[PDB]
Design an enzyme around this catalytic site. Structure first.
Site, PDB file in Angstrom:
ATOM      1  N   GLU A  78       6.715 -90.604  79.587  1.00  0.00           N
ATOM      2  CA  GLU A  78       5.911 -89.386  79.680  1.00  0.00           C
ATOM      3  C   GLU A  78       4.438 -89.598  79.406  1.00  0.00           C
ATOM      4  O   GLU A  78       3.623 -88.767  79.795  1.00  0.00           O
ATOM      5  CB  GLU A  78       6.443 -88.316  78.728  1.00  0.00           C
ATOM      6  CG  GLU A  78       7.861 -87.836  79.017  1.00  0.00           C
ATOM      7  CD  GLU A  78       7.980 -87.035  80.303  1.00  0.00           C
ATOM      8  OE1 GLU A  78       6.943 -86.660  80.897  1.00  0.00           O
ATOM      9  OE2 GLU A  78       9.124 -86.774  80.709  1.00  0.00           O
ATOM     10  N   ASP A  83       1.891 -82.092  85.320  1.00  0.00           N
ATOM     11  CA  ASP A  83       2.964 -83.076  85.403  1.00  0.00           C
ATOM     12  C   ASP A  83       3.234 -83.483  86.861  1.00  0.00           C
ATOM     13  O   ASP A  83       2.506 -83.074  87.775  1.00  0.00           O
ATOM     14  CB  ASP A  83       4.225 -82.577  84.669  1.00  0.00           C
ATOM     15  CG  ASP A  83       4.956 -81.450  85.401  1.00  0.00           C
ATOM     16  OD1 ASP A  83       4.639 -81.147  86.573  1.00  0.00           O
ATOM     17  OD2 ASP A  83       5.883 -80.861  84.794  1.00  0.00           O
TER      18      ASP A  83
END
Ligand SMILES: O=[N+]([O-])c1cccs1
Length: 162
Positions: free
Chosen positions: A11, A20
């Site tokens: 991440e 994202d």
């Protein structure tokens, strides 16, 4: 290696609001803020999550606190899900990390179509499960990450994360 180090690799860590892989406002270590295209809505979610007026920026400590909560909540969710709990409980600790990783990324709703993969995992048919897992939007959209997670499911080792 452990779930925190694994997800930290997958991440990243960013202290300002970013989008994202799906285009959604996010902060920290993959903490999804909202699916709303309105940046102000994301900022509101951030302030609510942190408990102060952040103006779209947080500290490393704050990012890590959200991350702890998010990992914890992912596990607790899996355990409350009648479809997921038996498979999760059947796994060794390393493969459990792969399960948490997948749920962290896709959500429980995201894992809904993985019924056949889940069965193969519970059966410990590891190569077959790995083949089935890759036949997915997930794999196609995030192949390098999915390959790491799938290797973890296939082998029960941390080989993909070194
Ligand atoms: O709970 N599990 O064993 C899961 C595996 C993959 C997504 S969730």
């Amino acid at each position: 290696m452990n779930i925190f180090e694994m997800l930290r690799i997958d991440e990243g860590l960013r202290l300002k609001i970013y989008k994202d892989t799906e285009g959604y406002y996010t902060i920290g270590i993959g903490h999804l803020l909202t699916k709303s295209p309105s940046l102000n809505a994301a900022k509101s979610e951030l302030d609510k999550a942190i408990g102060r007026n952040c103006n779209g920026v947080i500290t490393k400590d704050e990012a890590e606190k959200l991350f702890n909560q998010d990992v914890d909540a992912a596990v607790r969710g899996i355990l409350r899900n009648a479809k997921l709990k038996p498979v999760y409980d059947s796994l060794d600790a390393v493969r459990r990390c792969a399960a948490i990783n997948q749920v962290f990324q896709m959500g429980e709703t995201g894992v809904a179509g993985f019924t056949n993969s889940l069965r193969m995992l519970q059966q410990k048919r590891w190569d077959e499960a790995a083949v089935n897992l890759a036949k997915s939007r997930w794999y196609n959209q995030t192949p390098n990450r999915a390959k790491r997670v799938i290797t973890t499911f296939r082998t029960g080792t941390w080989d993909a994360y070194k």
